[PDB]
Design a protein around this ligand. Structure first.
Ligand SMILES: CCCCCCCCCCCCCCCCCC(=O)OC[C@H](COP(=O)(O)OCCN)OC(=O)CCCCCCCCCCCCCCCCC
Ligand code: SF4
Ligand code: SF4
Ligand code: SF4
Lengths: 70, 41, 140, 180, 116, 387, 130, 340, 59, 77
């Protein structure tokens, strides 16, 4: 995660580790800019998420299984 | 202003436009701007 | 008459569509030739495929191609549109629109010049000048 | 704690009255602001056009513009390409396929030389790295084949293309090679 | 701030609850079959859809871990999501249906002799 | 209760420069629910540059965002040269800054033109493309093509400018302010664009920060923050640069803030025409970018550097970085995890056209469809910057 | 005043010129004609940018690539000087024929392509002993 | 019997050849207005493009399984027959004294300009597409709402006329140059005139690919050239209709031709000349009018349906009802009423 | 370092701001002369109608 | 109720995998009496709701184990 300040002009990074098996929860509960990006994360990886509405595919074909950035 | 582009008033310049010297790009520092900020951070 | 008016429908997918709309720019104008494209696949004649062509797009492209009247041609505008071009090694790209639609004039290169697109258009019209359809009814 | 980010000064800006005194109703009522735009486009109507009659005229062709991959040779040219493979290893769509062999007279030459003009992005890195300056982007846009089979340039097409013009390429290099 | 057909992502813990949840998913995925045949205009019949859906779930009858069955449930409910409306197209949709034999001609009878 | 239907907005040509497949649902021709649908164009650059070298990476990299090319080149090059602990000399920084600002002129010009064409006026579109053709030439006298360019490198740029270019670009910028006023006089003032654009698509700053928006829409929502004045990459520090600030978060201030950025970027082209130093325009050493092609044929070491710089790419030190600059569509970020080898172990782009598109549903509600056509073009939805 | 500035052509070439180009450029200094075609630069005082240099093609079946490509810069403004001026720049040519096929696309004699070499593997020749 | 059929062939070939070259004309003038050049290549000079385009786009002819051919094969012929052509039955100042029309002029033009609207509506009725026919109902609704304030203003300008036959307006208007010099609501008539024949800055139902990659239906083929020709012919008819009543025919040099024809001809040499200059007057009053249509094509963008109905039923129509609260009032005040 | 394209030894700076209303008569005279024109137009119009008062009874 | 289960014992008989319709006692189990799969249980439930053109909620699909329960929910319209 890269985050950006506004008052402070200062970036930050925040990392977790997730397995294809087990999910990690999303951050869409805090703000609304997430629910597009986490779709992108799920589509490119199959890093499955949690606590999230509309976990679709965007970034591939609709019948396409597999996960490309693996 | 005026005297800008075509339908010309016969006034232009492509001459005496130089600064002839030998360069003096005195630098070596890769990353030293950040060190105070890194110490803060 | 067919060689004179000659309007396409934009399919216009990427950077090569930016050069296509540069042919609508005043420097190398379309309308000095007659190219006045509608946004409708029935009112069209030729179907300029520009930009790269995803795996995801291609059924929509062929469905656009079928709802198009019978004197139809296809211009492959852009290297990616023919033989896959600069990606060509994606899971999600189609290796050339020859796998999808029959093409009559290719146009090379990432983004081909507005010069290049008009040169391909004149070569297509030069092909039209050898269609010989009426004397092919006469079976020459 | 100074933390100097402040001072947008937040203009309250009531702006209730005294914009106009019935002139407002005039400019709203009839389209004076819009008739102004009509007068602008009429004044634009009289000025010069910009069309370039493309079969008969041409847009500006810079010497560093990229084209169709003509192979140069020397003066009395012994096929200047040496199959040095540097122009292979940077073609970013892998549109280069070369094979080489020691030819009969001892030197190394290209057995086959292959450009996928299907997938040549025209980055010019081929030109930016072939050390003997033997593969060169042309300025010519001379194209529009009807088959892919008329695009896949072998060695003979590129040597022929360099033999068709080196005049233009000599003009190009002699305005560019002290910058390359 | 929206949905399209109420795709929810919340994996439960107990394997019984996941069983019931996949069961209700199977009911909706089976109920939408005449809607599928309407929507895509296939050649085959609605019972062909039903026996192939049953085939697809019998492909993963004997998968042990609930923490694999979670993302299998997500894949199932998510492709139900992309089938219940017209996101998928029929060219995209026939990738589940090895329908015809006559495309292949004579081919491998799964003997060693006819690998050669 | 609600019984609403749906439409598919654009298969091919709804908004120009976008394959805008928008699955849009209406009750009363009101967009109660908005579901942007992009990703038709997933060309997969994000995968492809994991097997390409860094010199090979850049002509992938401006194929994303195909209306602001060498700015995207520049953000990738800043991400790499930040990860090299090198610094391009001052000639390189000034020519990349002036090229970033003619690129900014080009991007905002094509955005406002395609916006106004979707809104309906045809003349601003063509008048703007008339000097977009001159900017195409100003690429062409530097690059190898009209709009795409491998001109920026991580080690600075490809090559120094030719003389007649720098002489001509002043004479271009002499008239560009006049013609920018000329296209400005028939849109900014009229009652159309004043009800065609009203407080429409109002995005508050509390929400806009929570949406991951950036750039022109952010500064339209009245937060005086970009990157260029605030995290100054590449000599924007050294040039007088004033940044316009919105007051109302609608599309009208998002119009006027671009129209102000034109006549702010022209000052940059002015002072970068003046302050242009003389110096090395590549990086100073030759371990990392390219040797000069003169002495690569009179020297051993220049040949070995030439050879390895076009075979194995080059060494990059390991680790992560992220670098964002304000492209004229918003904050572009590049997130690169470098292996310590010839090729990037991971590159993730970050696109305003992928965030603003994500925000689109939260913005579009409570409008009509011809509102939505304009609100596409306001937030710079050129879908070659999706993936 | 473009009418009498087209009167300088002479109407025999004008009624062909209008049949060739929509505009009628003033017939000006010819530069030098080439292998197929005739050119013109233009010394007219009042014409727009980059509509100075142009071509009469000598063929009703007209196109590009009839230009011998040394002139192609001079029709694309790759050089101020007309290419029939300097001999020391112009002569690398001892690759002796200069046949210059323009383009053959759609013509039956189109360019096609082929592997240059031979197959990579060289199958055995059926020689039997006793 | 032979003279009137060759009359009607001359007038039909005038209007047809006219509306043929009008599209080339507008594209040229857009192009110079867009700082480029129009069709400059077609054949012999560059005046010919539409005359080749008509022969081009005949030879396409698709049909659609979502719709009966029997309605869409006739509904663009409907507005080609009635809206385009038999609006000229009134001979909208066939620019001489004479016409090819008996009498009772203006409300015939009203009736046929009224008759075109469900030619548009039944056109949009086709294909049974739930996203299409609502756009059709949108188009027809704004179309009738500006039909109403064509109607309610050219019935109030004839309150200075009171005679309903075609010519009497024109012989009435030669004294004042009555048309615009006494009243400038011509301009709102003009801004009404872009809507009731939509060749507009409104473009409203031409949401070309905002719908499923098609705007009206995409009935391409002969119905396309029918719709295209009828739209342009409705434009030159309603533009003539503007130049008929609220802009003037019979330019004042023919009023001064008393000081010219009495200095030119002796006595009635086959009426050789005056119909020609009268036609010249009406033609230059007509093409100079539609030059402003070709302005407003490329000056101001589309116009946002809800604001368009705002622009009809809230602003222009109450101003209008004021304006014929005064034009009955002011002539009653100042001196008196008109006879017939 | 040799002769590269350095700058000019001057600037001659150029336009970077907005432009203006056209002629001097911005105010309501651009409306009020409208009331002049109608103030002429009816001045003949009704009069012509007034003259048709004599004309109709002539016939 | 009367001859609703005639239709149900027609549909389930028309459904396969039940080789003995004499084993179909009407008031009897699904998975105990006939060895129906838990997947196949709700499969024939959806077959039943599709035959009568009726739509059921989720808990009504949860509770069905014997067809007397099914007929008892069929009775709701
Ligand atoms: C007093 C003595 C004489 C007495 C007789 C009086 C006769 C006077 C003649 C008629 C009077 C003219 C009245 C003009 C009506 C126009 C009114 C109007 O357009 O209102 C603007 C309105 C703005 O929209 P809205 O936001 O709802 O306004 C509320 C803002 N708080 O609506 C809009 O949205 C604006 C849309 C307008 C679209 C116009 C498009 C361009 C038209 C320009 C072409 C015309 C130029 C050619 C003709 C000129 C010839 C000189
Ligand atoms: S062909 Fe070239 S210009 Fe077109 S999309 Fe592909 S990379 Fe871009
Ligand atoms: S120009 Fe670029 S794409 Fe073409 S062969 Fe050379 S390096 Fe490869
Ligand atoms: S770079 Fe030069 S030596 Fe190497 S393959 Fe290309 S032409 Fe031959």
């Amino acid at each position: 995660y890269n985050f950006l300040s506004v008052r402070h002009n200062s970036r930050i990074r925040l990392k977790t580790y997730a397995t294809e098996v087990t999910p990690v929860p999303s951050i869409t509960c805090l703000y609304e800019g997430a629910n597009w990006f986490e779709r992108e994360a799920y589509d490119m990886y199959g890093v499955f998420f949690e606590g999230h509405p509309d976990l679709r595919r965007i970034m591939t074909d609709y019948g396409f299984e597999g996960h490309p950035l693996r | 202003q005026a005297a800008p582009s075509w339908e010309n008033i016969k006034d232009i310049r492509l001459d005496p436009k130089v600064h002839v010297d030998e360069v003096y790009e005195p630098i070596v520092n890769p990353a030293d701007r950040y060190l105070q900020h890194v110490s803060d951070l | 008459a067919r060689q004179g008016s000659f309007w396409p429908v934009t399919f216009g997918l990427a950077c090569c569509a930016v050069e296509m709309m540069h042919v609508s720019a005043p420097r190398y104008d379309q309308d000095r030739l007659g190219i006045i494209f509608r946004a409708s696949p029935r009112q069209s004649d030729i179907m300029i495929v520009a930009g790269t062509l995803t795996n995801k797009m291609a059924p929509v492209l062929r469905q656009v191609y079928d709802q198009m009247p019978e004197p139809r041609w296809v211009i492959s505008m852009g290297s990616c549109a023919n033989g896959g071009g600069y990606y060509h090694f994606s899971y999600s790209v189609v290796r050339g629109c020859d796998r999808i639609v029959p093409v009559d004039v290719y146009v090379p290169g990432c983004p081909p010049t507005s010069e290049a697109l008009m040169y391909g258009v004149f070569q297509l019209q030069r092909k039209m000048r050898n269609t010989k359809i009426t004397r092919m009814w006469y079976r020459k | 704690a100074p933390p100097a980010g402040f001072r947008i000064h937040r203009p309250a800006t009531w702006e209730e009255s005294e914009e106009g005194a019935l002139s407002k109703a005039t400019k709203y009522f009839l389209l004076a602001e819009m008739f102004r735009g009509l007068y602008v486009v009429l004044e634009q109507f009289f000025r010069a056009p910009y069309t370039i009659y493309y079969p008969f005229e041409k847009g500006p062709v810079s010497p560093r513009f990229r084209g169709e991959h003509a192979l140069r040779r020397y003066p009395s040219g012994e096929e200047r390409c040496i199959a040095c493979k540097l122009c292979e290893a940077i073609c970013p769509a892998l549109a280069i396929t070369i094979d080489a062999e020691e030819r009969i007279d001892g030197s190394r030459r290209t057995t086959k030389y292959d450009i996928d003009m299907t997938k040549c992005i025209y980055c010019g890195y081929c030109q930016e790295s072939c050390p003997v300056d033997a593969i060169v982007e042309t300025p010519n846009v001379e194209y529009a084949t009807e088959t892919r089979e008329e695009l896949l340039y072998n060695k003979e097409k590129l040597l022929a293309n360099g033999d068709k013009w080196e005049l233009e390429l000599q003009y190009a290099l002699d305005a560019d090679a002290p910058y390359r | 701030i929206a949905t399209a057909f109420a795709e929810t992502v919340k994996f439960s813990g107990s394997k019984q609850e996941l069983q019931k949840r996949t069961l209700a998913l199977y009911r909706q995925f089976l109920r939408g079959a005449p809607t599928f045949a309407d929507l895509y205009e296939v050649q085959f019949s609605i019972p062909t859809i039903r026996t192939k859906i049953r085939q697809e779930f019998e492909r993963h009858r004997f998968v042990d871990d609930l923490s694999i069955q979670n993302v299998l449930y997500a894949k199932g409910h998510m492709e139900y999501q992309e089938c219940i409306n017209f996101w998928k197209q029929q060219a995209q949709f026939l990738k589940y249906f090895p329908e015809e034999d006559d495309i292949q001609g004579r081919h491998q009878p799964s003997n060693f002799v006819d690998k050669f | 209760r609600i019984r609403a239907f749906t439409i598919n907005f654009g298969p091919q040509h709804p908004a120009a420069h976008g394959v805008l497949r928008l699955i849009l649902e209406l009750s009363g021709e009101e967009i109660i629910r908005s579901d942007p649908h992009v990703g038709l164009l997933h060309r997969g650059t994000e995968k492809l540059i994991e097997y390409k070298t860094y010199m090979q990476a850049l002509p992938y990299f401006d194929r994303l965002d195909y209306v602001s090319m060498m700015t995207n080149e520049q953000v990738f090059s800043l991400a790499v040269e930040k990860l090299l602990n090198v610094e391009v000399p001052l000639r390189g920084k000034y020519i990349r800054t002036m090229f970033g600002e003619i690129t900014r002129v080009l991007n905002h010009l094509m955005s406002v033109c395609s916006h106004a064409m979707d809104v309906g006026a045809l003349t601003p579109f063509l008048w703007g493309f008339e000097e977009r053709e001159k900017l195409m030439e100003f690429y062409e006298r530097v690059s190898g093509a009209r709009l795409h360019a491998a001109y920026v490198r991580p080690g600075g740029v490809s090559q120094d400018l030719p003389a007649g270019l720098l002489d001509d670009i002043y004479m271009w910028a002499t008239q560009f302010g006049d013609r920018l006023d000329e296209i400005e006089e028939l849109l900014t003032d009229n009652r159309i664009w004043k009800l065609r654009t009203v407080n429409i698509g109002t995005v508050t700053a509390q929400d806009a920060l929570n949406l991951g928006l950036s750039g022109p829409m952010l500064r339209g929502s009245g937060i005086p923050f970009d990157i260029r004045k605030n995290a100054p990459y590449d000599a924007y520090d050294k040039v007088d640069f004033d940044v316009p600030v919105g007051m109302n978060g609608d599309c009208y201030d998002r119009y006027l803030i671009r129209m102000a950025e034109f006549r702010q970027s022209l000052r940059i082209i002015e002072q970068c025409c003046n302050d242009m130093p003389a110096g090395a325009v590549k990086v100073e050493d030759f371990k990392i970018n390219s040797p000069p092609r003169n002495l690569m044929k009179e020297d051993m070491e220049a040949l070995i550097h030439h050879f390895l710089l076009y075979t194995k790419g080059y060494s990059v030190p390991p680790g992560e970085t992220y670098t964002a600059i304000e492209a004229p569509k918003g904050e572009m970020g590049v997130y690169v995890v470098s292996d310590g080898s010839e090729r990037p172990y991971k590159c993730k782009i970050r696109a305003p056209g992928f965030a603003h598109l994500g925000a689109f549903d939260h913005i579009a509600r409570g409008h009509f469809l011809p509102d939505a056509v304009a609100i596409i073009g306001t937030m710079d939805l050129v879908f070659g910057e999706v993936d | 005043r473009v009418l009498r500035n087209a009167w300088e052509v002479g109407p025999r070439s004008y009624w062909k010129q209008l049949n060739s180009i929509g505009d009628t450029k003033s017939g000006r200094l010819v530069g030098t004609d080439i292998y197929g075609n005739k050119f013109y630069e233009t010394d007219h005082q009042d014409e727009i940018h980059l509509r100075t240099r142009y071509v009469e093609y000598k063929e009703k079946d007209y196109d590009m690539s009839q230009v011998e490509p040394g002139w192609h810069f001079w029709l694309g403004y790759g050089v101020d000087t007309a290419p029939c001026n300097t001999p020391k720049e112009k002569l690398p040519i001892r690759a002796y024929p200069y046949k210059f096929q323009p383009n053959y696309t759609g013509t039956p004699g189109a360019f096609v392509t082929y592997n240059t070499l031979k197959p990579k593997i060289s199958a055995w020749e059926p020689v039997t002993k006793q | 019997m032979i003279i009137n059929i060759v009359e009607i062939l001359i007038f039909l070939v005038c209007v047809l050849f006219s509306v043929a070259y009008l599209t080339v004309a507008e594209r040229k003038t857009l192009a110079y207005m867009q700082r480029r050049l129009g069709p400059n290549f077609v054949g012999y000079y560059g005046l010919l493009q539409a005359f080749a385009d008509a022969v081009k786009l005949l030879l396409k002819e698709i049909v659609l399984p979502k719709e009966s051919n029997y309605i869409i094969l006739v509904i663009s012929p409907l507005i080609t027959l009635i809206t385009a052509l038999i609006g000229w039955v009134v001979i909208p100042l066939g620019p001489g004294i004479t016409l090819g029309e008996l009498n009772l002029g203006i409300l015939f033009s009203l009736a046929i300009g009224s008759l075109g609207v469900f030619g548009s509506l039944l056109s949009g009725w086709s294909s049974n597409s739930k996203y299409s026919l609502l756009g059709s109902i949108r188009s027809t609704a704004q179309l009738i709402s500006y039909e109403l304030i064509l109607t309610s203003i050219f019935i109030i300008i004839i309150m200075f006329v009171s005679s309903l036959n075609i010519t009497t307006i024109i012989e009435t208007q030669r004294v004042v140059w009555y048309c615009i010099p006494l009243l400038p609501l011509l301009l709102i008539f003009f801004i009404a005139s872009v809507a009731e024949t939509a060749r507009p800055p409104f473009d409203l139902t031409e949401s070309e690919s905002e719908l499923v990659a098609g705007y009206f239906t995409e009935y391409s083929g002969s119905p396309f050239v029918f719709f295209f020709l009828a739209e342009y012919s409705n434009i030159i008819l309603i533009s003539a209709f503007n130049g008929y009543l609220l802009l003037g025919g019979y330019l004042s040099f023919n009023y001064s031709y008393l000081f010219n024809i009495l200095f030119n001809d002796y006595s009635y040499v086959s009426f050789l000349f005056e119909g020609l200059i009268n036609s010249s007057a009406y033609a230059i009053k007509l093409v100079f009018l539609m030059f402003s249509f070709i302005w407003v094509r490329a000056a101001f963008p589309r116009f946002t349906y809800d604001n368009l109905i705002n622009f009809c039923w809230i602003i222009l129509l109450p101003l209008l009802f004021g304006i014929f609260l005064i034009i009955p009032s002011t002539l009653y005040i100042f001196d008196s009423f008109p006879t017939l | 370092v040799g002769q590269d394209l350095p700058p000019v030894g001057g600037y001659e700076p150029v336009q970077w701001r907005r432009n203006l209303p056209a002629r001097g008569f911005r105010p309501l005279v651009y409306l009020a002369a409208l009331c002049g024109i109608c103030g002429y137009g009816f001045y003949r119009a009704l009069g012509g109608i007034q003259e048709r008062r004599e004309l109709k009874r002539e016939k | 109720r009367p001859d609703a289960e005639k239709r149900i014992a027609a549909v389930l008989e028309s459904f396969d995998k039940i080789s003995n319709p004499a084993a179909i006692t009407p008031t009897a189990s699904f998975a105990k009496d006939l060895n129906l799969d838990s997947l196949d249980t709700v499969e024939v439930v959806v077959a039943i709701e599709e035959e009568f053109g009726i739509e059921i909620p989720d808990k009504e699909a949860d509770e069905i184990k014997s067809v007397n329960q099914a007929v008892e929910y069929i009775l709701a319209q």
